Amino acid sequence: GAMAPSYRVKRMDIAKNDEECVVNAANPRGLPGDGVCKAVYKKWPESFKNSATPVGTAKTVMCGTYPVIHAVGPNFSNYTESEGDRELAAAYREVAKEVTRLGVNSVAIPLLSTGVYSGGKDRLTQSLNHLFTAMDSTDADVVIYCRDKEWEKKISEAIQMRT
Ligand SMILES: [Cl-]
Ligand SMILES: [Cl-]
Ligand SMILES: [Cl-]
């Protein structure tokens, strides 16, 4: 575990993370995809061997000795608000189980279902709160990656609000 388990946020490409493993915002089919998923495919393409997994789950595949945890959030274009919320919570719970199993001291994680799976809504608070519900009981250092300056400020404020 980390000596003083923490949450942090950085505004940069998660493919350039400084953590012991990465969470991919995957599609269920293990396809290269776009956004975070395409960056992850370019950096760790070996991790997409048999990475297909259903919505609400996470599947880890090693790239060398570096673990890539493929976490499949719901596409809110297809799910109801109610069912989508349940599957988004479940995907983060499966990430917490994998991070624990791997014995890593740190993990890089994007906000699931906030980009092309958002169904055109702002889901920063929804997705971040499900991330906290899952990861709070883990002792890995968690580093959240985002691309937008306003999102960085809101995620940083939400972390600091608990501290
Ligand atoms: Cl960058
Ligand atoms: Cl997304
Ligand atoms: Cl962002």
Swiss-Prot record:
Name of the protein: Non-structural protein 3
Subunit structure: Interacts with mRNA-capping enzyme nsP1. Interacts (via C-terminus) with host G3BP1; this interaction inhibits the formation of host stress granules on viral mRNAs and the nsp3-G3BP1 complexes bind viral RNAs and probably orchestrate the assembly of viral replication complexes. Interacts (via C-terminus) with host G3BP2; this interaction inhibits the formation of host stress granules on viral mRNAs and the nsp3-G3BP2 complexes bind viral RNAs and probably orchestrate the assembly of viral replication complexes. Interacts (via C-terminus) with host NAP1L1.
Membrane topology, as annotated: Peripheral membrane protein
PTM: Phosphorylated by host on serines and threonines.
Organism: Chikungunya virus (strain S27-African prototype) (CHIKV)
Binding residue positions for ADP-D-ribose: 13, 27, 35, 115-117
Taxonomic path: Viruses, Riboviria, Orthornavirae, Kitrinoviricota, Alsuviricetes
Record-annotated Macro domain positions: 4-163
Location of this chain's protein in the cell: Host cytoplasmic vesicle membrane
Function: Seems to be essential for minus-strand RNAs and subgenomic 26S mRNAs synthesis. Displays mono-ADP-ribosylhydrolase activity. ADP-ribosylation is a post-translational modification that controls various processes of the host cell and the virus probably needs to revert it for optimal viral replication. Binds proteins of G3BP family and sequesters them into the viral RNA replication complexes thereby inhibiting the formation of host stress granules on viral mRNAs.
Domain free text: In the N-terminus, the macro domain displays a mono-ADP-ribosylhydrolase activity. The central part called, the alphavirus unique domain (AUD) has a zinc-binding function. The C-terminus region, also called hypervariable domain (HVD), is mainly disordered and binds several host proteins. This intrinsically disordered domain contains 2 SH3 domain-binding sites and 2 FGDF motifs necessary and sufficient for the formation of nsP3/G3BP complexes.
Outcome recorded upon mutating residue 117 to A: Partial loss of mono-ADP-ribosylhydrolase activity; complete loss of ADP-ribose 1'' phosphate phosphatase activity
